[PDB]
Design an enzyme around this catalytic site. Structure first.
Site, PDB file in Angstrom:
ATOM      1  N   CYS A 137      24.808  38.007   1.102  1.00 30.43           N
ATOM      2  CA  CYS A 137      24.800  39.260   1.848  1.00 30.43           C
ATOM      3  C   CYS A 137      25.566  39.138   3.163  1.00 30.43           C
ATOM      4  O   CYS A 137      26.484  39.921   3.423  1.00 30.43           O
ATOM      5  CB  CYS A 137      23.357  39.707   2.087  1.00 30.43           C
ATOM      6  N   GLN A 164      18.527  39.647  10.320  1.00 25.86           N
ATOM      7  CA  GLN A 164      18.518  39.938   8.892  1.00 25.86           C
ATOM      8  C   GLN A 164      17.259  40.683   8.474  1.00 25.86           C
ATOM      9  O   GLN A 164      16.159  40.420   8.980  1.00 25.86           O
ATOM     10  CB  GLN A 164      18.694  38.654   8.080  1.00 25.86           C
ATOM     11  N   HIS A 277      21.444  44.265   7.555  1.00 24.13           N
ATOM     12  CA  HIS A 277      21.732  43.021   8.261  1.00 24.13           C
ATOM     13  C   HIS A 277      22.688  43.326   9.401  1.00 24.13           C
ATOM     14  O   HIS A 277      23.710  43.989   9.193  1.00 24.13           O
ATOM     15  CB  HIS A 277      22.391  41.973   7.358  1.00 24.13           C
TER      16      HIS A 277
END
Length: 373
Positions: A137, A164, A277
């Site tokens: 990610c 995150q 994020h």
């Protein structure tokens, strides 16, 4: 023109976001024969996207999987390990499109993030690469924001300090985050409703609660709501988390730069957000460029990045999980020259990890793979 595409893990969180996006873009109209697989419900109902096959096939039956021309899996790394090598050993030469990290560092696999590395995908397809894997990610979200600088070889190194979201750990972790928010408030609900109550009493009750065994922390192990967690994934034993180690390796493979790789380092920290994020990044660039030229390079990279002028009002409106959640936009801002010299800049970016960090590169590379036959 007769391709069979099988879907595994469509019912989980990432797979459910994928299905939603494919519905929104009418992707199944471009899939001649779609099939849905199951680890638990063989013969049960497939999601109805208009496909002919209305019943679920066995995800664990390698012979059933080998009937597909393309497998799209969001089931996860353990599933991939259970069937992938057995599938290839049987002679299956179809396409494997995977959200998981299993095959990311295999030489016969490409990390697909087509707004950044379409040229790499197009070359693998012509050269017989059959494995197109979603990237971690943080790296994919970072390159969606900063690809203009990397793709132009303007980056000497970068350290990213991350904020995150719970979604990267899973649905259970997201449910635990909101539960903790509710349980924190419930400890001081009366005091908060009393405008004359003392702040230090509210404060002491909340801090006591984050250290109490009544706080719901079954999944993270420690509080997230009201707190943070400065380690993500397993301990590699060298002071580095696996989340941090995926930084340099994945970034440099997406670009194709494992020969003279750019250093990507930093610290990965969980905070109490649902599914965006955010990253606060120090970069050393190979040139002393003005902010305006850096910003132009960033803006020109792809259709989804949004350069935010480095002002307070725009920054707090645009560069937040509140703004970005559930959208495909990848804002990047706080672009400033740093005190160390003209070649040092700051950048702050926010990105949804269930979209560009997971499901969205998969639907796009599925379309690319289908558009190539």
């Amino acid at each position: 023109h007769h391709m069979k595409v099988g879907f595994v893990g469509w019912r989980g969180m990432v797979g459910s976001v994928l299905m939603q996006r494919m519905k929104e873009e009418n992707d199944f109209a471009h899939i001649p024969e779609a099939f849905f697989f199951t680890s638990s419900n063989v013969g049960g109902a497939a999601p109805d996207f208009g496909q002919a096959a209305k019943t679920l096939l066995d995800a664990n039956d390698v012979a059933e999987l080998a009937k597909m021309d393309i497998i799209v899996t969001c089931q996860g790394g353990d599933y991939t390990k259970s069937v992938f090598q057995a599938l290839r050993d049987s002679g299956w030469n179809g396409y494997w499109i995977d959200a998981a990290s299993s095959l990311r560092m295999k030489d016969d696999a490409i990390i697909a993030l087509d707004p950044v590395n379409r040229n790499v995908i197009d070359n693998g397809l012509k050269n017989g690469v059959k494995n197109y894997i979603g990237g971690n990610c943080t790296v994919s979200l970072m390159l969606m924001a900063l690809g203009g600088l990397f793709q132009n070889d303007l980056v000497e190194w970068a350290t990213s300090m991350t904020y995150q979201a719970a979604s990267g750990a899973g649905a259970k972790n997201m449910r635990e985050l909101i539960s903790g928010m509710g349980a924190i408030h419930a400890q001081v609900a009366d005091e908060l409703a009393d405008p004359s109550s003392a702040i230090l009493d509210i404060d002491r009750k909340v801090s006591d609660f984050l250290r109490s065994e009544d706080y719901p922390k079954a999944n993270f192990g420690v509080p997230l709501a009201g707190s943070l967690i400065p380690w993500i994934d397993v301990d590699l034993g060298n002071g580095q988390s696996k989340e941090e180690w995926k930084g340099g390796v994945e970034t440099n493979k997406i670009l194709g730069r494992s020969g003279n790789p750019t250093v990507i380092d930093g610290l990965c920290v969980r905070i109490g957000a649902m599914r965006c994020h955010s990253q606060a990044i120090t970069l050393k660039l190979k040139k002393d460029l003005p902010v305006s030229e850096i910003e132009a390079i960033l803006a020109g990279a792809n259709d989804w990045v949004k350069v935010v002028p480095n002002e307070k009002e725009a920054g707090i409106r645009e560069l937040t999980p509140a703004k970005v959640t559930g959208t495909l936009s990848v804002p990047v801002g706080r672009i400033r020259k740093l005190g160390m010299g003209g070649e040092y800049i700051s950048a702050f970016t926010v990105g949804d990890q269930l979209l560009w960090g997971a499901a969205e590169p998969m639907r796009r590379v599925l379309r690319i793979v289908l558009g190539s036959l």
